[PDB]
Design a protein around this ligand. Structure first.
Ligand SMILES: Nc1ncnc2c1ncn2[C@@H]1O[C@H](COP(=O)(O)OP(=O)(O)OP(=O)(O)O)[C@@H](O)[C@H]1O
Ligand SMILES: Nc1ncnc2c1ncn2[C@@H]1O[C@H](COP(=O)(O)OP(=O)(O)OP(=O)(O)O)[C@@H](O)[C@H]1O
Ligand SMILES: [Mg+2]
Ligand SMILES: [Mg+2]
Ligand SMILES: [Mg+2]
Ligand SMILES: [Mg+2]
Lengths: 335, 335
C-alpha cells in the first residue's frame, strides 16, 4: 500500500504529508509547510537527536512512534531543559502496510500532546523493497535550559546520592521476548514514557541536580560507567536496592539476560548532593513508573572504599560481596 | 569491519564516537558527550530535518555525507536564516566497510567547516545485515532567522521575478547514470554545495526576499508548483531561460529523463519584487554554480495571462507555445 510514489516528492508525497502527518501532529508551526519551521525560543537551549530501529515495531506498552517521541523528549530533559519542539524524519520501505504507518503516526501525535511538545518539521523518505526493514524514525528535540549550572555527565561529585526513577530491564525484556513469541507475564511491558514533567519539578523545585541520564542502550550499568568516567569518580551501587520486577528477573534468567544491562525507555538516573536526595526521591515517586523509585547508591572519590579507579562502577552484591559492573561486549534493535 | 558491537551502546560504541565522529567534527559543544548539546542561540530560529538515502553513496561531485550537511544547511537557509548547528543520526548496516564510514564522516566534517557550521550532537545505530542498505543519515539544522518578514512559500506575489541560482538536472542525472555505470561527460556531476553564504547576502544586502526554496525531489517543476500553490498564484517560466548544460540535456534525453523534474542539491529558487531582481541576480552570479544564475520567469495573478488557475506553473516553450508543468507520477534514492 505504501508505493514508491510517496517518496518521489510529487503530488502523492504532498498528500501523505497533509492528510496523515499534519492531521495527527496538528499545529500552525508545522502547518506552514515550508523548508524549515520557525521557532521562538529562549536563549540557552538543549538539542538531541536519536534514530529508532526497534524490532518489532509494536510491543506491549509501546511502539516505534512512542519510542521516537518519548526517547527524544527524555534526552532533551537530561540536560535540565524543557523540551518544546521535535522534528521527525521517516525512512520507509516500499510495500509497507499503510495502517502500520498510521498507527505509528497516531502514537507520535498522542505522545507529543501528552509531553506538551509539538512536531514542527519533518521528512519522509520511501526506499525500494528490501532497502530497509519496514521503518526507521529519527527525531530531534529542542528545549529551553531551565537552570545554571545544568545537569551534565561530568558533574557527579563525592557524597552524591544515586537515585533511580523505577524498575530496570522491562523494555529490553519485552522486545526480546516478543521477538521470540514469548509472553512471560502481563507484568512485563515496555516502560516507554515521557519524563520531562518529573525533570522540570526536580530541577526547579528540588534544585542542585548534578546528573540526569536515561539508561537506554547498555542499561543502568553502562550509563553509570559513562557518568563515573565523565566525572572521574567511582559509583557504588547496592544490588538489593536496584528495583527489578520478579517477573522481569525470572524472564531475564530464563533468557540468559542481565536486567542491569538491558535498555530502558521510561527511566532516569538522578545524581545530586545528599541533602537534596530525599526531596528528589519524593518527586521521583510521583513520576512515571515511580512506584519503584529508589536510592541505589552513592558517588565516591578514588580510593575512598576502595581500590576501584576513576570510571569504575562497583556493586555491593546481595550475597555480601562485590561485582564490578563493566561495559558490554549483542542485543540488536532493542530501540 | 563494522560489527554489530558498534551499535550496542558499550565500549566499542563509545570508541567509535570519540575516535571517529568527534575527531572529524571537532568542537567543544559536541565534545561534552552528554545526552544533549547546549546551544546559545538568538530568538527567532529556523529548524529543518532531512534523511539521506542516496544510492550510490559515492558519485562525481559528492557523497551521502556531503548531501547530509549541504542539504540541511540549505533547508535552514531557505527561511532566510543563518544555519549554526547540526545534529547527525547515523543508521548503519552490520558488515559495512569501515573506510566507507570514515570517508563519509570526513566529508561531513569538511562540509560543515566550509559552511561555518558545527555538528553538535549525534546518534549511531547499527542494524543487522540486510536490515538497511549500507547507510542512511539524518541531519537536523538549527539557525538564526535574519529578517522579518522572512522568506516563505506563501509569499510569492504578482509582479515578482523568479530567479534560479544555476543549472538544472545535474545531480539527478549523475546519480542515475552512476547507478547504470555510465559517464556521459566530465561535465556531469553532483552540484552538492552549501548556499548559506549566498542567502545571507541576499537577505541582508538585497532585501525584501519573498521566497527561497531548493529544487530537490521533483526538481524545479514541483517546487514552482509548491510555491504557486502556497502563494495561490501562477508561475510563468521561459523554457529557453532555464539553464541546463548541453551534456545534461543530452544525458537526460538518452535516458528519457526531464531535467526540470530531476533533483538538484546545490541550487535555489529566489522570488522577490521586480526592482530588487537585478541586484539579487548579481549576488546569485557570485554564489555556488552561479555561472548560470538567471531570471527564469515571473509571478502573476490568476487570469493575468492566462486561464491558468492558482497553483499552476506555465512554461512558454522554446518553440513559441506553452507547456503546463504539473507535479510527477519513479526515481528512487536520488538523495
Ligand atoms: N514525516 C513528516 N512529518 C511532518 N512533516 C513532514 C514530514 N515529511 C515532510 N514534512 C513536511 O513537509 C514539507 C515538505 O517537506 P520535504 O521533505 O518535501 O521538503 P524538503 O526537505 O525541502 O525536500 P526534500 O526532502 O525533497 O529535499 C516540509 O514542511 C516538512 O516539514
Ligand atoms: N554519529 C555521531 N556523531 C556525533 N556524535 C554522536 C554520534 N553518535 C553518538 N554521538 C554522541 O555520543 C554521545 C552518546 O550518544 P548516545 O546515542 O549513546 O546517547 P543516548 O542517545 O542518550 O543513548 P541511546 O542512543 O542509546 O538511547 C552523545 O553526546 C551523542 O551526541
Ligand atoms: Mg525533506
Ligand atoms: Mg540518553
Ligand atoms: Mg542516541
Ligand atoms: Mg528544501
Amino acid at each position: 500500500t505504501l508505493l514508491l510514489d510517496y517518496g518521489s516528492g510529487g503530488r502523492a508525497s504532498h498528500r501523505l504529508i497533509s492528510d496523515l502527518f499534519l492531521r495527527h501532529f496538528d499545529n500552525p508551526i508545522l502547518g506552514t509547510l515550508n523548508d524549515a519551521a520557525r521557532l521562538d525560543l529562549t536563549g540557552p537551549l538543549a538539542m538531541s537527536t536519536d534514530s529508532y530501529t526497534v524490532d518489532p515495531i509494536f510491543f506491549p506498552g509501546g511502539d516505534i512512534g512512542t519510542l521516537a517521541v518519548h526517547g527524544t523528549v527524555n534526552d532533551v530533559s537530561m540536560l535540565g531543559a524543557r523540551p518544546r519542539y521535535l522534528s521527525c524524519g521517516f525512512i520507509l520501505e516500499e510495500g509497507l502496510d499503510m495502517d502500520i504507518l498510521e498507527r505509528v503516526v497516531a502514537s507520535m501525535g498522542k505522545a507529543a500532546r501528552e509531553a506538551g511538545v509539538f512536531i514542527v518539521t519533518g521528512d519522509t523518505k520511501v526506499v525500494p523493497r528490501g532497502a530497509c526493514d519496514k521503518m526507521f524514525i529519527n527525531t530531534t528535540g529542542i528545549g529551553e535550559i531551565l537552570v545554571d549550572p545544568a545537569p551534565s555527565g561530568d558533574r557527579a561529585r563525592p557524597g552524591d546520592a544515586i537515585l533511580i526513577s523505577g524498575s530496570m530491564g522491562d523494555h529490553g525484556l519485552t522486545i526480546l521476548s516478543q521477538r521470540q513469541g514469548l509472553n512471560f507475564a502481563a507484568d512485563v511491558c515496555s516502560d516507554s514514557a515521557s519524563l520531562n514533567r518529573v525533570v522540570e519539578k526536580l530541577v526547579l523545585e528540588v534544585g542542585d541536580i548534578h546528573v540526569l541520564r536515561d539508561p537506554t542502550r547498555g542499561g543502568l550499568a553502562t550509563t553509570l560507567n559513562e557518568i563515573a568516567g565523565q566525572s572521574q569518580a567511582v559509583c557504588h551501587v547496592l544490588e538489593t536496592a536496584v528495583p527489578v520486577r520478579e517477573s522481569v528477573r525470572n524472564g531475564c534468567s530464563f533468557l540468559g539476560l542481565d536486567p542491569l544491562y538491558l535498555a530502558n525507555e521510561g527511566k532516569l538516573i538522578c545524581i545530586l548532593p545528599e541533602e537534596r536526595a530525599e526531596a528528589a526521591l519524593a518527586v521521583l515517586r510521583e513520576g512515571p513508573h515511580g512506584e519503584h523509585a529508589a536510592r541505589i547508591g552513592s558517588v565516591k572519590s578514588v580510593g575512598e572504599l576502595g581500590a576501584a579507579r576513576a570510571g569504575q562502577v562497583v556493586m555491593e552484591t546481595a550475597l555480601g560481596g562485590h561485582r564490578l559492573l563493566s561495559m558490554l561486549e549483542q542485543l540488536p534493535r532493542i530501540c
